């Protein structure tokens, strides 16, 4: 739930996976979290760190 204050969760793979198994990289109903920012100076005037 967007993490607790003093959480320190540096996990990887998939968040609790779910009812769907790993299935190699992701499978059907899965994705890989921890994606790089890649923010651009023009894509979002307020959407940038």
């Amino acid at each position, epitope marked *: 739930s967007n993490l607790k204050p003093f959480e320190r969760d540096i996990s990887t793979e998939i968040y609790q996976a779910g009812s769907t198994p790993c299935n190699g990289v*992701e499978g*059907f*109903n*899965c994705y890989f979290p921890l994606q790089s920012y890649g923010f651009q100076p023009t894509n979002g005037v307020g959407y940038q760190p």
Partner: nanobody
Amino acid sequence: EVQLVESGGGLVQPGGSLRLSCAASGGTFSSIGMGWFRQAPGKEREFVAAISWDGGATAYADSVKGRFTISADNSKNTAYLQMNSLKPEDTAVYYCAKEDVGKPFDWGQGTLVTVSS
């Protein structure tokens, strides 16, 4: 019933390129589990590529890195898959899925894609 419409599949020369397009008839307009799967003759249906609906993110299998590109949009409610330098082994019928939230899988009909001279 969740009807999936597929187009663009057909015969292509080796090393060629096509433009697949699979649209969805709404499907609650919210799903986080779609992907592209093909079933080669005499082979079990494996994973090829996928795309996330919550963003413009892309994801591909290890064997289709770079050569295959997938792009989706919210206004037209579809996803265009572009192939490059198709191999003879790539000859298989693709399938586009749509996994509704808290619901089982949804599958379409697919189109035959033949890669031969």
